[PDB]
Design a protein around this ligand. Structure first.
Ligand SMILES: COC[C@@]12CN(S(=O)(=O)c3ccc4cc(Cl)ccc4c3)CC(=O)N1CC1(CCN(c3ccncc3)CC1)O2
Ligand SMILES: [Ca+2]
Lengths: 235, 51
């Protein structure tokens, strides 16, 4: 997260953090329930074996409310490939139930039509994670959240230098030095409507970090809902 | 009518029944009496900052 604030206690309770054997945090997640996590598809490459952590807000200080969960099964998307990054989405089923407490609650999956009509038409959204602080920086120690304006779908394709498909959507700033970044991947993009946050998008890719004339490319969640279900009902 | 005016005055999901609006809520919620608001069931409902 380049720029942006810091997640105060209880503010970003749905954040999840995939960690490698080296205990390092390399990607993010979204708690969809006590048993399922929503991550990116490319986050399922950068590693051999990994766990999912929750409740963490400071990656080096026993806040007592943290907790590690193993991965029973991993549901990666079939139409996905690195050559386009299209269909960047995957769903994790935990080996043991997430116990919701302070700094550990799940986000809501909204309905498709209502999400597209009233959520993504909302001005801004919220992206969060432990990723880098500037393009060439290091994983953050504290948890960050950035308010990222929704970007005109058109501008999106122009400003980009890659095919912005229907499964993705731009978000961020043109000039301003605020964007998600490396490590923030798989993280959660949530829209806020009446003090109840919804899972609108999955952190995916971008060209650099906070670069002028470039935006944050997130995975369109509404365009995978039915899939996220058939994934939780396991399939 | 019109989920366009202000989400039909709903709390979460807003839909239309060819004449009036019908509100609904996310898993773990229950639609109140006024048929517009939503209310939790557990102490950790999806979408709420654990404050
Ligand atoms: C190894 O390369 C890393 C990276 C990600 N990073 S990154 O780790 O800093 C990174 C990752 C996810 C992000 C998500 C948001 Cl919303 C904002 C900034 C982000 C920055 C920047 C980059 O230019 N690249 C290029 C790349 C790989 C190639 N690519 C496409 C390929 C085919 N079709 C579309 C896009 C764009 C992303 O990954
Ligand atoms: Ca910690």
């Amino acid at each position: 997260i380049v720029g942006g604030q810091e997640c105060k206690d209880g503010e970003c309770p749905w954040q999840a953090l995939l960690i490698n054997e080296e205990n390092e945090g390399f990607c993010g997640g979204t708690i969809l329930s006590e048993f399922y996590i929503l991550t990116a598809a490319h986050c399922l490459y950068q590693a051999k074996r990994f766990k999912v952590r929750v409740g963490d807000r400071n990656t080096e200080q026993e806040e007592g409310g943290e907790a590690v969960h193993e991965v029973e099964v991993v549901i990666k998307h079939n139409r996905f490939t690195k050559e386009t990054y299209d269909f960047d989405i995957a769903v994790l089923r935990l080996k043991t139930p997430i116990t919701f407490r302070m700094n550990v609650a799940p986000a809501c999956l909204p309905e498709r039509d209502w999400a597209e009509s009233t959520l993504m038409t909302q001005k801004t959204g919220i992206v969060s994670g432990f990723g880098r602080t500037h393009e060439k920086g290091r994983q953050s120690t504290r948890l960050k959240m950035l308010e990222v304006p929704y970007v005109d779908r058109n501008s999106c394709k122009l400003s980009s230098s890659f095919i912005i498909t229907q499964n993705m959507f731009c978000a961020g700033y043109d000039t301003k030095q605020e964007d998600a970044c490396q490590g923030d991947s798989g993280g959660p993009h949530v829209t806020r409507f009446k003090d109840t946050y919804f899972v609108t998008g999955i952190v995916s890719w971008g060209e650099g970090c906070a670069r002028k004339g470039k935006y944050g490319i997130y995975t369109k969640v509404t365009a995978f809902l039915k899939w996220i279900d058939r994934s939780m009902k396991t399939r | 009518k019109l989920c366009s005016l202000d989400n039909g005055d709903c709390d979460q999901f807003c839909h239309e029944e060819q004449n009036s609006v019908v509100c609904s809520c996310a898993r773990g919620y229950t639609l109140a009496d006024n048929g517009k608001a939503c209310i939790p069931t557990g102490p950790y409902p999806c979408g709420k900052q654990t404050l």
